């Protein structure tokens, strides 16, 4: 029963006898399979026979770990000064893009739709653009409107450039007002592709047909990042200590971490519009995530920028490599406070490596996260046995394989590009691993296969505020390290907490 002194919400409530009895009663008329049949098919789904068939799939995706392009577009556009994402297309999309981001950051996510309906299939979506741009500009006072497209607008084939010019012709926005656009078709690639497409679209808008006035500064693109808030602050702290001349292109770190102080800030922070315009002058542009920027880096290359791309740098080596590149670009040495942070991270790893050596992992997410995570794992003596990226290409699989080959703890490790979490389930069932590194969808894999989850990948929906803390840098590597160790110790205490049976090993000191 319910009780006002100790109120039972859904979780404990439906375990009470009256509901257990009513639910048993309901089950008798549900025509669901009998309990012996469920056990049979459950065990079968964890079998090798099933894994061969599951991996024989050609058409069906089940539990993919990726979103569609416009999510990436909204994300990247949200890291520019007072910029509103305008997704030309159907509006249900925008409800979803926003909800998804909000559930992850526990923050507002602002975006608007051109609200194309069925008629736009016959007449095209011009009026939606013209009217939409007008209303978005008047209501939400953006400095820039960043147009992307839903899959309906792509199939219909609307000419965005023409539409935007028509809109300016009719006075929807000032003639000189900034309306960069990009095609972001959901049926190509994923959200990382939309990050790239929208970012190029923005840069092309400000750079088209200009001649650089070269400077020695570096543009840094962080890419699609669940940990954007802490990571970008760590990045800035690092760059500041080194004294590097830089511009971050797309910084959502303030936008998705505004204070609760009586005012709601629709926009906050961002790459300044003027800095985006002067970014064409930089001699370098580095991407922290290759797979978020290939089109954008090619475009930067078209203005004679030298380009470098990393893979979500996590841990000692990856950070070292980033710092060395920054040092090569800026001419500035790595300062002693950063060697200390480094030496202290090494110290943590050395103190704790008995618990990491030999551990086996499954890892999934965006291709760059997975590379960078797997690499960090190898530094610890761990084995990234099952690496998986639904949005991972063959070129990625080759890069992963090169990473595996660089270390003796790589023997046996595989990278599964274009596979999904139903595939991952069969891996975890048949070739057990100690730990799963992924995102909140991975809780279902924890449930189905008794493989504990560590959340280091977008989206994190069932934990709060992890995004506020870095994973990049030496500081961030230490957080990751402690996050692993905490999951590991803890599993050790749970393995040894049963009095007189297992608690011989319940050590006070570990």
């Amino acid at each position: 029963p319910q009780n006002v002194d100790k109120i039972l919400d859904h979780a404990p409530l439906f375990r009470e006898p009256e509901y257990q009895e009513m639910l048993a009663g309901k089950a008798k008329l549900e025509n669901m399979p009998p309990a012996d049949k469920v056990v049979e098919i459950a065990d079968w789904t964890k079998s090798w026979e099933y894994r061969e068939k599951n991996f024989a799939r050609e058409s069906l995706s089940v539990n993919p770990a990726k979103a569609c392009q416009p999510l990436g577009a909204v994300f990247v556009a949200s890291g520019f000064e007072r910029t509103m994402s305008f997704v030309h297309g159907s509006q249900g999309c925008v409800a979803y893009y926003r909800s998804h981001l909000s559930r992850h950051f526990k923050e507002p996510s602002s975006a608007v739709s051109s609200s194309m309906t069925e008629d736009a299939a016959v007449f095209g979506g011009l009026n939606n653009m013209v009217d939409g741009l007008a209303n978005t500009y008047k209501l939400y006072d953006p400095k820039m409107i960043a147009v992307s497209t839903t899959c309906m607008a792509e199939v219909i084939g609307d000419d965005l450039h023409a539409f935007i010019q028509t809109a300016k012709g009719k006075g929807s926005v000032p003639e000189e007002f900034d309306v960069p656009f990009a095609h972001t078709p959901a049926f190509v690639g994923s959200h990382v592709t939309g990050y790239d497409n929208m970012l190029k679209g923005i840069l092309e808008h400000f750079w088209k047909g200009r001649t650089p006035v070269p400077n020695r500064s570096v543009n840094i693109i962080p890419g699609f990042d669940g940990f954007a808030v802490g990571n970008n602050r760590e990045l800035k702290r690092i760059l500041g200590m080194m004294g590097v001349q830089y511009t971050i292109l797309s910084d959502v770190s303030d936008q998705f971490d505004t204070p609760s102080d009586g005012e709601y800030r629709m926009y906050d922070g961002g790459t300044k519009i003027e800095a985006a315009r002067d970014a064409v002058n930089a001699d370098y542009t580095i991407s922290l995530q290759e797979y978020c920027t290939p089109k954008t880096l090619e475009y930067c290359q078209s203005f004679g920028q030298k380009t470098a791309s990393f893979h979500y740098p996590l841990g000692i080596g990856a950070t070292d490599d980033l710092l060395q590149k920054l040092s090569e670009i800026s001419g500035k040495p790595v300062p002693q406070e950063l060697e200390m942070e480094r030496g202290r991270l090494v110290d943590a790893l050395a103190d704790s490596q008995a618990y990491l050596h030999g551990k086996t992992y499954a890892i999934y997410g965006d291709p760059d996260f997975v590379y960078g995570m797997a690499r960090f794992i190898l530094e610890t003596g761990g084995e990234p046995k099952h690496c998986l990226a639904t949005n991972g290409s063959k070129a990625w699989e080759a890069q992963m394989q090169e990473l595996f080959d660089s270390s003796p703890f790589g023997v046996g490790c595989k990278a599964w590009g274009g596979k999904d979490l139903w595939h991952m389930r069969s891996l975890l069932a048949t070739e057990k691993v100690d730990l799963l590194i992924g995102n909140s969808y991975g809780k279902y894999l924890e449930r189905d296969t008794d493989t504990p989850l560590i959340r280091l990948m977008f989206p994190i929906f069932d934990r709060h505020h992890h995004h506020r803390f870095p994973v990049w840098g030496y500081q961030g590597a230490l957080r990751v390290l402690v996050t692993l160790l905490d999951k590991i110790f803890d599993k050790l205490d749970d393995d040894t907490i049963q009095a007189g049976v297992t608690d011989y090993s319940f050590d006070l000191t570990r």
Partner: protein, 480 residues
């Protein structure tokens, strides 16, 4: 310090209308109003509804796919629901609606999963029907306990002229399991609403339109279907216990915790108890014409409505069921009394603004009143004229009313009114909290619930109290 609420709300309407360009202003002016003056009607909520959203205004609405896959179909536990089109829609809608169910997920139920055709460019160019055929085979192999499959069409499907109905006919024969193609592409309609109508008509056309199939089912004079309770945080379970205790038999609850078998049998019942009028009156109207099954509206938010509902429903049967109603109302009185004594002192006199989809913007009001709280603003994402009509049974004159409200309008109305609580969705939550105003999600129940029924009412009160009467608010102003 002092205001007149009707006139202050009319001012807030005028303020927000000034921010629009003239074209958008003319379209929006008929969606905003103050309730005028007119069981019983308290007020008249005269506002236009269920039309195009205005472009670029930051509407809160979803699409027909949400209404069909997310709302009606996705909760059916023993079917695989294919999100047909590119990966997006089924990712965003994966496990976000808390339409609870008992099952082994992946094995005998498929709710908290994404199944998708993951359309690539080749699929847009050459069509996706050959892909769907292959998909259905692959589902049949790898999820053999699925008693059926639905094909939830995302935007591209209709735009490229794919024939999913041909495929469904073809594969139902081939595999002997029901296949339900739904034309819930987001470009259809203006909102989630049409997704409901389309989905309801898909139930009629691909589930009811068939053989036998449960001729073995023993009936009683007390058999009902509960239509349109999607079991948010177990809402339908805490509704069902009361209906059973009163002496009814619930043949099927649509569609929270529902199996295909339960839905298939709905024609065998004596009466449809419709909670969510908006999402499922369509199938109830069909069920009155074709089978001669009447429907009735009820409401299980708060003790006033639950009592009135139990009595109204029981009056449709006989003495024996009427006595059960009174027994259920009497049984739960100590609980109701305990909740009211604990929490009404802490909440009475507090002002609430609401914004939800198609039912809750009126349906929860009475439960707020049972705790002494007043609703000063309410509104629907996708209500129809008949939902606004019914809103006047619940809200007082002077209540600010807003249909398909915009981010701009809603922010300005919340800043102006500064209610003690806002009840709306995930995209509204965080800005409102940032303004120093308590907020409780009225879709997901903020990961709590149930709120339906008597066991629900306690949890509902606890939740409104814990959001309003919390130390965090006093710490917004830094002490310097």
């Amino acid at each position: 310090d002092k205001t007149n609420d009707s006139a202050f709300h009319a001012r807030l309407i005028a303020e927000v209308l000034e921010a629009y360009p003239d074209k958008a202003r003319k379209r929006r002016q008929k969606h905003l109003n103050v309730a005028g003056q007119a069981g019983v009607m308290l007020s008249e909520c005269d506002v236009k509804s269920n039309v195009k959203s205005v472009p670029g205004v930051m509407t809160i609405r979803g699409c027909a796919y949400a209404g069909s896959k997310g709302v009606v179909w996705g909760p059916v536990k023993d079917m695989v629901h294919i999100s047909h089109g590119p990966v997006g829609c089924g990712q965003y809608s994966w496990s976000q609606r808390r339409n609870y169910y008992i099952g082994n997920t992946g094995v005998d139920s498929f709710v908290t999963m994404q199944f998708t055709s993951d359309f690539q460019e080749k699929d847009i160019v050459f069509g996706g029907d050959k892909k769907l055929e292959k998909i259905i085979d692959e589902i049949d192999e790898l999820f053999p306990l699925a008693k059926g499959i639905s094909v939830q069409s995302e935007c591209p499907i209709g735009l490229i002229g794919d024939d999913i109905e041909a495929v469904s006919r073809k594969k139902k024969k081939e595999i002997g399991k029901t296949i339900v193609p739904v034309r819930c592409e987001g470009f259809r309609g203006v909102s989630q609403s049409l997704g409901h109508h389309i989905a309801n008509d898909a139930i009629r056309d691909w589930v009811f339109d068939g053989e036998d199939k449960h001729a073995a089912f023993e009936t009683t004079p007390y058999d009902v279907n509960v239509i349109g309770d999607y079991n948010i945080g177990g809402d339908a379970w805490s509704s069902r216990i009361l209906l059973e205790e009163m002496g009814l038999r619930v043949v099927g609850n649509w569609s929270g915790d529902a199996t295909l078998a339960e839905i298939e049998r709905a024609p065998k019942a004596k009466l449809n108890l419709i909670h969510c009028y908006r999402s499922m009156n369509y199938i109830c109207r069909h069920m009155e014409e074709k089978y001669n099954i009447p429907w009735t509206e009820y409401n299980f938010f708060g003790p006033s409505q639950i009592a009135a509902s139990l009595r109204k429903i029981a009056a449709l049967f006989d003495e024996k069921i009427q006595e059960g109603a009174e027994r259920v109302i009497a049984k739960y009185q100590p609980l109701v009394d305990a909740v009211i004594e604990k929490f009404r002192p802490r909440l009475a006199g507090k002002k609430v603004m609401l914004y939800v989809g198609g039912l809750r913007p009126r349906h929860v009001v009475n439960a707020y009143n049972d705790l002494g709280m007043e609703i000063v603003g309410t509104g629907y994402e996708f209500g129809h004229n008949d939902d606004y009509q019914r809103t006047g049974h619940y809200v007082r004159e002077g209540t600010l009313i807003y249909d398909d409200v915009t981010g701009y309008e809603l922010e300005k109305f919340i800043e102006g009114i500064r209610p003690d609580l806002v009840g709306s969705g995930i995209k509204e939550k965080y800005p409102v909290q940032k303004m120093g105003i308590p907020f409780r999600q009225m879709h997901s129940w903020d990961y709590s619930g149930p709120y339906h029924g008597y066991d629900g009412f306690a949890i509902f009160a606890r939740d409104m109290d814990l959001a309003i009467n919390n130390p965090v608010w006093s710490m917004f102003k830094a002490p310097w």
